[PDB]
């Protein structure tokens, strides 16, 4: 008709959509078809098992069921409590649970909410990591934090910055903190960090010459 037809198969009970044998004629096109069909079936299961209301379509995103957020808060403060008591690994497991539950929120629910929650949890777990001196993973988590929330998140920038300088990536740290100051949260801790970085950079290779 006015579109490119694709022969498909349907599994009754399973409700799943299968691709016909070589439906499109191209390995690329066929693989793309297979991945898309995978996403389709996954979405179908999602709609079937995660819509609590009687209408079988996703409710508008802006009024959000606050249960999940509340649980995430609980495990967050659980992690914080385990942090103040200075046993960090447990706090890390808890923070991890928080990230997992936050990232498994239905995709049709507000992504910005996800960004908020995972930004804070990522920053917290990062700090907990750099308490145990495990720098790379901490820098990773802090980077994820900044990726989720770029502005008004100076602590994350700072934390990845110090992680970077701790593992002797001084230039990367310099530029990272430098750009982190352009997006604006509170400044002067990032400023202190930067002054330490470029002072250490001057001192480092004043001794090379």
């Amino acid at each position: 008709d006015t579109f490119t037809f694709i022969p498909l198969h349907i599994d009754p009970k399973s409700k799943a959509i299968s691709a016909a044998p070589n439906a499109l004629g191209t390995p690329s096109a066929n693989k793309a078809l297979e991945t898309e069909l995978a996403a389709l079936n996954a979405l179908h299961r999602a709609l079937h098992t995660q819509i609590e209301g009687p209408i079988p379509v996703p409710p508008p995103p802006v009024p959000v069921n606050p249960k999940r957020s509340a649980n995430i808060n609980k495990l967050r403060e659980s992690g914080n409590a385990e942090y103040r008591k200075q046993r960090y690994g447990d706090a890390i497991k808890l923070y991890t649970l928080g990230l997992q539950m936050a990232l498994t929120r239905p995709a049709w629910e507000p992504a910005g909410l996800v960004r908020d929650e995972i930004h804070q949890l990522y920053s917290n777990r990062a700090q907990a990591y750099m308490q145990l001196g495990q720098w790379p993973e901490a820098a990773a988590d802090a980077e994820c934090s900044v990726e989720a929330k770029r502005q008004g998140n100076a602590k994350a920038w700072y934390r990845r910055g110090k992680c970077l300088m701790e593992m002797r990536r001084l230039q990367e740290a310099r530029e990272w903190v430098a750009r982190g100051l352009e997006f604006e949260g509170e400044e002067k801790e990032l400023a202190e960090l930067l002054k330490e970085i470029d002072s250490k950079l001057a001192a480092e290779k004043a001794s090379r010459d």
Partner: protein
Amino acid sequence: NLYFQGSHLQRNIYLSLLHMEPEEGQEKAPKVPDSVIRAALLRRAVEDIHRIIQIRTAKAACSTLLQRGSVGDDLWQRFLRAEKEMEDELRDVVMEANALVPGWGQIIFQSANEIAANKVLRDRLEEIEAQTARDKEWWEKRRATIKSEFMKELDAEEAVEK
């Protein structure tokens, strides 16, 4: 059937689900549930989100085209035409959504938009998380030269040439 961003895969899958063909000799339409059709339409909507945001991203990216002669102008007009076509597609998806579930077309692209956003976030996060392993191996190889801090007070016996 002709689009600015390639053949619409999701649209084709939707319309193929609607016009299902004999699965075998039997010439019986293998009845496909309305739930599947709805899911497929939502997928189509997500793809449409990506496409429209791509076009409008172009427009800002490619603005100086208007200052680059008749050829840049012609390209800009191309972009405009593409946008209008895609808007027509969005409308079609909306009224199809309403036809499936009355009123759904008022929120289907809100949900679709959120789905797209979430996907993108997951991807960026995943490359960040993927870097961590080799960052660890690099750090382990680098830290081999750094002096141990536990009771660093006591130092190596310095070399005195005699």
